[PDB]
């Protein structure tokens, strides 16, 4: 009916959504940290191969290891650039889109909760006009509904309330007298939900226009009908006009950069299909006057014994086993590269071996 | 004044604040971009010195350049780690804090704007009860008041509405019948602003309690008085209880990591006062007494003035990378090569040539 409260079938999905949205910022922190961690891990790999080369100038694996060092360098350096130029924006965009939409939901729900007055005024109701939802701490009846934003810390958010498709649990309809999301008359009423003057909010004159609230989701009529709830289940371009904050949280969520993305992970598949690897074969190893078709593939087979992805493994294993003795970079005890993961530490070790490598040349040249 | 509309003196500050908050996300994007940029600059310096060493093994500047190389590496690697562990959270925090607050403000302002109906219902008024503010695109009575969020793109926000101290332009007072933020009665009314049943919103019974709206800033009474506006000018711990979203945007804004912070910038001071530089003298250069690092630095650089590294850095910058290295088309000095991907390719190629040199010297 006109001007009864909103049923729990309509507001409980909003409580679920605000609960879900509350963790998006934190999930964006977590995802950013994992992106940076991945960049770091690839930098560490660059460093390990670099250190092995500096320590072992006479290696018989010079070309294989040069290639791999170059590969990891491109991947970490390009990854960090991609995070700056594209990735970080997606994560900030989604955190703020969720937070903006959540702020409007929380404000409107709070206002409806607050318009409770004796038997005659109740806006968040259960299944009839007379029974207000009961707040107990952060719950409204049995549904978590904390109209607050938590501390930003790493989180894993739920993915049921705002999916790839849209907002599947938000109800849609209303706008007549069917008692769909506002029950039949009894005693309690929520005049805010009608902009008509006989039984609704305004004095004497109806509202000049229908009102859009909940950032465009809900229409408050200026005629003697129920509020309308828009269809948010199948989101798309048209919501940019009718419900921009809802379209924006949806699209931003779908466009989040992930640590598992191509930009921030090692390439996969056969060696000649790893585009950074293949390009570096041509950059670092081929003569500039190479005349051959598929020269990169041929060189990779000559280097690694085939094109399967696991053909690099014995080389990376050799790097990992290499022991860095106590005394390099002030280190107290020996350790194999495979146990040293800290980028600052690895940077120090590389620095020390580049000096040692220069000293080696000077000594050689001195001996003649 | 019970149940008349809000004067422009009260709501225009809210418009100003939502306008300012609209750019906070984009400023945090810019800030994070500059942090990364600074980390990349230091990395580029790490690479240039490395490349110089790989190309010039007999340099008489070996110790100086090894130290600088090591310093840039600690700085850039430590910087990125600091951004992951501490900085990035500060920036996402502030973006989302501002956005959350803005979402509440925009929703409530929108509602007030929307409760306009004939001569008798007007909630955002000018200076009297009968004159509603006029919207013209993004402006309300000529004040910017776009109840929307822009695209997230790098930009700089204003700092007049949410300052280090608080919210200086938001009014405070109300709660009686002084006509302070709601004008004397005439024909227009805003019944939402009173929770008392004779002239205000609710039918028959007053609201059970006062209502807190605008995320705690505004109190709607359940007695025959004007709304109350909280004092938000000097923020502090008391606002945690009563206006937590306002406290959160304010503290988060204050705590933003900046690209100019110590974790993302070169050290300054006399050379012996630069703690990374000093530590590395011991890590990389010093065998095994008092002031040994300072003494070594002075000898290496010909003094301890901060600019005593400049000669070494200028020599690196001048080093030409000829066409043909790492597929490059043209020659350029290191000083004109800034792209970290390109620099990593250059180092890769020169370390291979360097190892080939050793193998040749040992053969001969
Ligand atoms: C931390 O500190 C490091 C070290 O200082 C920073 O790394 C250097 O960063 C700068 C970029 O900011 C980079 O490029 C130089 O930038 C200067 C302009 O901003 C230029 O002065 C310099 O160019 C000179 O040398 C070129 C190559 O020789 C010349 O072609 C050019 O014409 C300039 O030459 C003039 O200047 C020299 C010396 O003053 C003098 O002989 C004549 O006037 C000459 O005509 C570069 O483009 C450096 O390459 C970086 N240094 C290294 C060693 O990598 C890092 O950015 C800092 N980090 C942060 C966050 O600030
Ligand atoms: C891109 O790819 C590089 C190259 O693989 C990765 O760098 C390696 O990262 C690993 C894991 O941190 C480093 O540590 C060593 O891992 C080896 C196994 O690595 C593979 O399997 C793990 C688990 O699935 C993957 O996470 C990893 O990506 C690899 O696929 C272990 O075998 C090593 O231990 C062995 O060696 C030491 C010494 O010989 C012994 O003490 C052990 O008992 C054991 O025999 C070790 O744990 C490894 O050092 C890195 N390699 C190099 C060259 O740096 C990057 O992490 C990856 N980047 C991303 C984002 O995935």
Swiss-Prot record, chain A:
<keyword id="KW-0325">Glycoprotein</keyword>
<keyword id="KW-0821">Trypanosomiasis</keyword>
<keyword id="KW-1003">Cell membrane</keyword>
<protein>
    <recommendedName>
        <fullName>Variant surface glycoprotein MITAT 1.1</fullName>
    </recommendedName>
</protein>
<dbReference type="GO" id="GO:0005886">
    <property type="term" value="C:plasma membrane"/>
</dbReference>
<keyword id="KW-1015">Disulfide bond</keyword>
<dbReference type="GO" id="GO:0098552">
    <property type="term" value="C:side of membrane"/>
</dbReference>
<keyword id="KW-0732">Signal</keyword>
<feature type="glycosylation site" description="N-linked (GlcNAc...) asparagine">
    <location>
        <position position="266"/>
    </location>
</feature>
<feature type="disulfide bond">
    <location>
        <begin position="123"/>
        <end position="190"/>
    </location>
</feature>
<dbReference type="GO" id="GO:0042783">
    <property type="term" value="P:symbiont-mediated evasion of host immune response"/>
</dbReference>
<keyword id="KW-0472">Membrane</keyword>
<keyword id="KW-0336">GPI-anchor</keyword>
<keyword id="KW-0449">Lipoprotein</keyword>
<feature type="disulfide bond">
    <location>
        <begin position="15"/>
        <end position="145"/>
    </location>
</feature>
<comment type="function">
    <text>VSG forms a coat on the surface of the parasite. The trypanosome evades the immune response of the host by expressing a series of antigenically distinct VSGs from an estimated 1000 VSG genes.</text>
</comment>
